[PDB]
């Protein structure tokens, strides 16, 4: 049990590769947004802030990982705890709705909670990351409530027309959305292997995230600035 508990250079590797794509991609967003006309620089603005905190979080993981500390528990169930995901989730999540909500017309009532939930469930997480012992699961589970809560909340402009700018903007906005929960998803599982349950080592929780990010990041912010263009170009 509790396999490979600590970060290697296997770990180390990956995250410098994904230090290196979340810069270019802020790079990239940063210089063609110059060539976008002003109604459509914000969605460019939020993706180069995402990718931008990324990199930040990512440059510090691959810096700092080898010192293999900080640590929980003890003897042979002692594991390495990598906090600074948490940092770069607690910004970079509000800012992935974000790039979703700007297609609605969710009132402000609504947006707190669903950012309030996020928060939460970031906040859940790194506590229970640094939890000994079986209560680290309470925070788990109602952290993964937090993310029942903020999908929801997010599922409503689908079919609340009320809460939507134009209902032809639907089908971009659903699939966008599915494509967001479906990634989100994983990482509670990721964390309950890993962080939670150490039956996952660090270095493969480290590449699974890593995906995840690029996956959740850098491919997510293209198809929202595609979806933003191709909108802006017809109405
Ligand atoms: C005006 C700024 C707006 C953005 C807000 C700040 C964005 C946050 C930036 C990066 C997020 C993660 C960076 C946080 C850095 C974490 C430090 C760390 O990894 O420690 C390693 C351990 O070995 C030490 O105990
Ligand atoms: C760019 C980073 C992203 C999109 C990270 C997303 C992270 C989550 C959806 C985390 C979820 C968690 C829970 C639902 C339970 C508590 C443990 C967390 C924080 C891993
Ligand atoms: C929609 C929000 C629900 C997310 C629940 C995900 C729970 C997955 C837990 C699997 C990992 C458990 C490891 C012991
Ligand atoms: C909708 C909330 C689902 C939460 C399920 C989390 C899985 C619990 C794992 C706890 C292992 C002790
Ligand atoms: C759309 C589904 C994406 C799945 C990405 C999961 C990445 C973690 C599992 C692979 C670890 C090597
Ligand atoms: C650094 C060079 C990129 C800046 C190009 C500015 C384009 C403005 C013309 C629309
Ligand atoms: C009716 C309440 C539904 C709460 C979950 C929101 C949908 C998430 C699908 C995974
Ligand atoms: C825009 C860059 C998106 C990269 C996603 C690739 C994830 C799989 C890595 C093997
Ligand atoms: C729009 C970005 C919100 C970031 C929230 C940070 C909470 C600590
Ligand atoms: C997850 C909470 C679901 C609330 C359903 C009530 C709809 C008005």
């Excluded at 080898?66 to 390495?80: H, I, L, S, V, Y």
């Excluded at 890593?210 to 170009?233: F, H, M, R, S």
């Amino acid at each position: 049990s509790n396999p490979n508990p600590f970060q290697t250079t296997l770990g180390t590797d990956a995250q410098w590769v994904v230090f290196a794509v979340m810069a270019l991609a802020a790079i990239v967003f940063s210089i063609a947004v110059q060539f976008r006309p002003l109604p459509l620089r914000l969605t460019y603005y939020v993706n180069i802030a995402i990718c931008t905190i990324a990199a930040t979080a990512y440059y510090a993981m691959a810096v700092n990982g080898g010192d293999n500390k900080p640590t929980a528990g003890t003897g042979a169930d002692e594991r390495q705890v990598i906090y600074a995901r948490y940092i770069d989730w607690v910004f970079t999540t509000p800012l992935l709705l974000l790039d979703l909500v700007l297609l609605t017309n969710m009132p402000a009532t609504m947006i707190a909670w669903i950012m309030g939930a996020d928060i939460a469930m970031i906040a859940f997480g790194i506590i229970g990351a640094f939890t000994v012992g079986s209560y680290k699961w309470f925070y788990f589970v109602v952290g993964c409530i937090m993310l029942a809560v903020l999908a929801w909340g997010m599922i409503n402009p689908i079919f609340k027309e009320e809460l939507q700018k134009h209902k032809e903007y639907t089908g971009a906005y659903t699939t966008l959305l599915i494509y967001l929960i479906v990634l989100w998803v994983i990482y509670p599982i990721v964390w309950g292997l890993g962080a939670g349950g150490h039956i996952i080592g660090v270095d493969v929780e480290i590449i699974a995230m890593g995906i995840l990010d690029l996956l959740a990041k850098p491919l997510y912010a293209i198809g929202v600035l595609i979806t933003v263009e191709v909108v802006y170009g017809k109405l």
